Amino acid sequence: STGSATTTPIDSLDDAYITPVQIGTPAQTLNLDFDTGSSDLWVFSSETTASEVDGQTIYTPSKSTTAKLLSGATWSISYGDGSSSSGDVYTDTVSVGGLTVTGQAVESAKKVSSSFTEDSTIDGLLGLAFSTLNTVSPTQQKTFFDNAKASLDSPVFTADLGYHAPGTYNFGFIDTTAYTGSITYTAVSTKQGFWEWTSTGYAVGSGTFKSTSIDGIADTGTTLLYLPATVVSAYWAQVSGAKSSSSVGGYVFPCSATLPSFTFGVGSARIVIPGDYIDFGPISTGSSSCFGGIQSSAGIGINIFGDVALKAAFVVFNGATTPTLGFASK
Template structure:
């Protein structure tokens, strides 16, 4: 490994590469239930615990309308899921509500906790993008959007870039279970990340954005998952575009022993630490300071995610075997979602913790002392990592309780390990070798009450 580190250091020096600062979004406000509803919408799983929000199945049939009852007859029948909420007589979400409401932007956490500077075009135009290992589109606010939606954002102007090229007949669309979508057309241009320039990178220009997307602080998204789940289509046929990292590899922008990127996230409690990404090299100081070798595990990218085996968990040293279990590392998710069995074991070990139907999540008293929180570990391959106890308190649930950072994955077939987990490790996404690596990155003891910030 030492020889690889040396080669990466030389590459970094020769190319003048820099860390990409993951800037804390000052407008981001944590909200437990809204973050959970966002994940219900994004991944489309069924909740297995009670609450206002649920998936409603619909049957759609393609065919010709019958003249007598104006409905399609024949053709293919397929099922779709649509996110709904139970509401009370005032229209507010209510687990015991008898009426049904549509889920809108106000129900979900649509802002990003971290944003990164990316330069697009010649001369370069700087935008703040959400780096997301759970998706594969690079889309930006563009001059094709209405002036109202552009307001408050840095907007990419294709006509101001001498290297921009229109990609005829190419379009993109991201859709979610609440009916919201983002869509537009495509071009290619130079994209610079951390001093590394990718030429002819497909850039998806937003021409339509639902309120869910428009109300965020960032200027778009940069997907870091695998190209297979990119949404670009040519003349209506799926033709996934390469992600920036995939293009770094295919265009030989980075050497064979540096076909990776890394992520280091810190809490707002870590006043002197700066969250960052690197592209083309590993921060050896963080690896050395961990006192451990990098724990590597092969990933399964068949679904487009950074998915790896995660077959063991422990609460205060008591093991919970999860034979065959998998997890994804997702920088686009704030919470960590695990099985109901694991959730129950964790919150049973926190005095006063309970499940709150109205908030659709586990909560525990704000009076809880950090020292009384359990040691909670999840595995990356064969190695277990502690989730920093302070991060078990995600956000105030009410005046007296925290909304837990670990919640139920419902019927989702794999764990979703977002920032609550990633803040405790230095994550290495080795795309060239199709593996994921980690070392612990636990900070000194911190004040639990500052989680509210």
């Protein structure tokens, strides 16, 4: 089997992307944030504290003839941005772009933190990291991909995120029309439960390439590119008027400035992030100070190849017995 679904930015900055997911019978369609950095499929629901729901579409398991309580199961997750959610669990039929999993754990939120309430466009998350990170207790649950894997034509999914435009998540096949050149594959460590890999270096604009190992995660659920402070400083030093602002919480730059591209290494291959992808607009409405899309990972504890980086590539998440990651230009 295969599946193919369009993923759409939630706003004009590509702050996140939402993908429609059918849950239950008859289908209830929710727009979920596909997150290769976590492993829980959780949704706003009829069980979510009323004061914490503000515009989201909810899953109502009582209206689904295929929903079954996963008795005794609870879940609770916290994300890198300090947001969180928790609740109980049902199993139900979940379909993404024509690909159906029966008996998928659908984690129903009883509580969500303010960041989720305040984002009316995201109805929940669909985790695509390794199932070892799943938070369901007492019985850890499998991701949608893990459940689908054996049925897929090939045990892979791909992320083709758009810049200020829709893109595509495919399951079970590689669309050879969706990228240019070849796909370069690189080793993955699953030891922390992430799609963790090692970039071979970087360049800033037309500058020479610096060969250096950068360990990080491919994370569709993180907006920006977070890299070591040395790398980030080298980038912003090439932008007139750029500075790191402790009050704002990262590098900012005047919008009158031209942003150089940023290149990262995948083996001997190179992915070029255009300068425009690194502009996240005014820090506040009307401000002349713009927020940068490359920021320091210092104090996160891991480097994160978030959407800024991934949307410059066609990315293969290869879930073969030994997982690997593939990157192509597009």
